[PDB]
Design a protein around this ligand. Structure first.
Ligand code: CL
Ligand code: CL
Ligand code: ZN
Ligand code: ZN
Lengths: 30, 21, 30, 21, 30, 21, 30, 21, 30, 30, 21, 21
């Protein structure tokens, strides 16, 4: 795998693909 | 945190994996 | 607004949309 | 859960907010 | 709901989620 | 207009709703 | 180019792609 | 409509342009 | 068709829509 | 990580994710 | 191919890397 | 190349078509 530059909803997509059935939590600052 | 890091620098899938439930 | 099927990555994109800075959890196992 | 509420069934944007932190 | 920062196709996604069966019109300047 | 506003500043879902048919 | 099924958000993303600055309407009721 | 043309059936990018303003 | 400004995964989406069954190759610099 | 169904544009978005700068081919005919 | 491996069937992110250049 | 051109300037669908298999 390569390093990622992911902003906005692209990060959530990436989390989705990485975590699958486990799901994930999305926790921005502030 | 990860949301900022991925966007303002880079992050790995492995770092992302830490946020799975 | 509307009610629709939101599945998979579209579901988490909608969560991103709705929640944004609040952040969210996506927990398919429930 | 969310998948049942929003994917299998249909949900509103307001129901989606149920899953915000 | 939270305020949105939506560019390009992300705005069209947002319109899609907001409008559902009603659909929507996408009208950029120029 | 809304396309520019959402991108160069911010916009609400409620503002977006105005563009549904 | 090609003919494919374009549904849901993918349909409106394709409209965005094709139309761009012209803008477009997405009117599923027809 | 577009959904019938492009989702239910298949459409080309040129048919999609039918829905541009 | 209109000219495109496509970065990151948006370009891959565009390639996907343009190429259909033919598929495509995605070849960034470096 | 996980195993899931990745189809269509989601498949090529995942390829983008995984491959990035390496680039990739998407060749559905095989 | 990839569609059979990852869409029809399921694949891992590591199998996806099979399709990187 | 095309990846950079589309992102740092603009590109046409027709230019993109050159990258289909
Ligand atoms: Cl973006
Ligand atoms: Cl889908
Ligand atoms: Zn989809
Ligand atoms: Zn984007």
């Amino acid at each position: 795998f390569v390093n990622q530059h992911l902003c906005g909803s692209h990060l959530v997509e990436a989390l989705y693909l990485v975590c699958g059935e486990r799901g994930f939590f999305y926790t921005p600052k502030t | 945190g990860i949301v900022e890091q991925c966007c303002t620098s880079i992050c790995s899938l492995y770092q992302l994996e830490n946020y799975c439930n």
